[PDB]
């Protein structure tokens, strides 16, 4: 049958520091799909649905900062990311069929975005507080990235885990085009480890 999916939602997430790592410390230069999945689920999470992050726009110049601990951690600095995402019903939770109420969950998602998320938002790690704000589709599409006009292949990046502790990790060639990273689905990734 055709599967339900929500409208697109759009959010601006910003922070002074970010640390996106490869679970398997220096940051990747841009967020992993996994870290973005984390941020959208901190905005609003129910076992009834699954948030699907489809696209991110890297708005700011990529800059890093070093922190020595006594022994180095390299962070991104002064980050702004616009995330496009939607949700679908969670087919791993068939028992929650009576809660599959699209108007209910779409309304709550909009309210949750507007008030900066129902939970604390972190940029890849707990010491890196993020700020979530509401943007519209229009703002998403028209905001100019620092990287507009060029593409960069960031090489192979951690994408996400698969669970029944993880059963699989997924990695894939990640290319930022005009600042835009359009995600592949897990099963379309270049590399799967069991």
Q: 104, 21, 8: which is closest to 54 by C-alpha?
A: 8
Q: Is 47 exposed, middle or buried (CB count within 10 Å of its CB: 0-12, 13-18, 19+)?
A: exposed
**Separation CA 43–CA 56 (nearest Å):** 16
Structural domain spans, the chain:
1-194
The CATH classification of domain 1-194, taken from the options 3.30.70.2660, 3.30.420.40, 3.40.50.720, 3.40.630.30: 3.30.70.2660
> 183 to each of 12, 33, 56, 180, how far by Cα in Å?
17, 7, 8, 10
What are residue 57's DSSP bridge partners? 82, 180
Is residue 176 a contact partner of residue 149, using CB atoms and an 8 Å limit?
Answer: no
**Separation CA 32–CA 38 (nearest Å):** 10
Q: 132, 94, 96, 130: which is closest to 113 by C-alpha?
A: 132
* Chain centroid to CA 71: 28
């Amino acid at each position: 049958g055709h599967m339900y999916r929500s409208r697109d939602f759009y959010v601006r997430v910003s922070g002074q520091r970010a640390l996106f790592t490869n679970p398997a410390r220096s940051s990747y230069s841009v967020p992993t799909r996994q870290a973005l999945n984390g941020i959208v689920d901190a905005i609003y999470y129910k076992p009834t649905f699954t948030n699907i992050v489809t696209e991110v726009k890297v708005i700011n110049q990529i800059q890093t900062e070093l922190q020595g601990v006594r022994s180095y951690v390299s962070y991104l600095s002064d980050v702004v990311y616009l995330i496009k995402f939607h949700f679908v019903w969670n087919e791993d939770r068939k028992d929650l069929n009576s809660d599959r109420l699209p108007a209910k969950h779409e309304a709550i998602m909009e309210r949750s975005i507007r008030k900066g998320g129902r939970r604390d938002v972190f940029l890849g790690t707990r010491e890196c507080l993020g700020l979530v704000d509401d943007i519209s589709q229009e703002e998403y599409e028209t905001t100019v990235s620092y990287y507009n006009g060029v593409n960069i292949d960031l090489g192979i990046m951690f994408h996400s885990f698969a669970y029944p502790t993880p059963l699989k990790s997924y990695f894939t060639k990640t290319v930022m085009k005009n600042g835009v990273i359009t995600f592949k689905a897990q099963s379309e990734c270049d590399i799967v480890n069991t």
